[model samples]
Target: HSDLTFCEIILMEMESHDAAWPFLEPVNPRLVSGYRRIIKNPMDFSTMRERLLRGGYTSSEEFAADALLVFDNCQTFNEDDSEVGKAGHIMRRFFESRWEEFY
Candidate 1:
């Protein structure tokens, strides 16, 4: 559900073996629940992006540049470790699957 915190969704996915948590123990459900409670308000990504730009973390162009940098770095993880490589492959596939949804 949209009300679910990212951590909750991630932990659930981890429990189902649909996600990985290589660097941490299985996430705490209580923490995830608390996060969900605190974020009950909805966020609009378009407005959030505009506000972030106005707050000077980046201009639109700079933000796009930074996103590209992240994508580039993620691409490099495709062959480092088996689990990471698998995750990367899934990421690539997801990107392709939702390519039309991206700006």
Candidate 2:
């Protein structure tokens, strides 16, 4: 079946979300204090797309893992009630539901 297309489809939807704004690009360690030490494996939608373009992913599961990582990291670094944190939860739930219906 279409593996790359599947990832792209979900990714596009995620990017379109308002909550996805913060995660569109990689987190700037300089801007966010102690981010580098806390979030060892930071992930973002743009980076994921670049990897997809370079054939960095071996399977759909790998792509999904990166997608989830974005949210996980958000939750890790920000408070649950904070704007970024709430957006992370919203996007994570959106991604999971779509993944279930599509996968």
Pick by lDDT: which candidate is best? 2
Kindly list the per-residue Cα lDDT of model 2 for residues 20-95, writing each as its tens digit. 9889999999999999999999999999989988888999999999998998899999999999998899999999
Model 1 gets an lDDT of 0.37
lDDT of each: 0.37, 0.92
The Cα error of candidate 1 at residue 59, in Å, is: 9.2
TM-score of candidate 2 on Cα atoms, chains taken together: 0.95
Q: For residues 1-103, what per-residue lDDT tens digits would candidate 1 score against the true structure?
A: 2222322332233224443332123223374444334333322223334434356443334333333333344344334466645654554454334332333
lDDT for 24 in candidate 2 is: 95
RMSD of each: 12.9, 0.9
| Poorest stretch of ten by lDDT in candidate 1 | 19-28
Pairs in clash, predicted candidate 2: none
**Displacement of the residue 23 alpha carbon in candidate 2, Å:** 0.3
Best by TM-score: 2
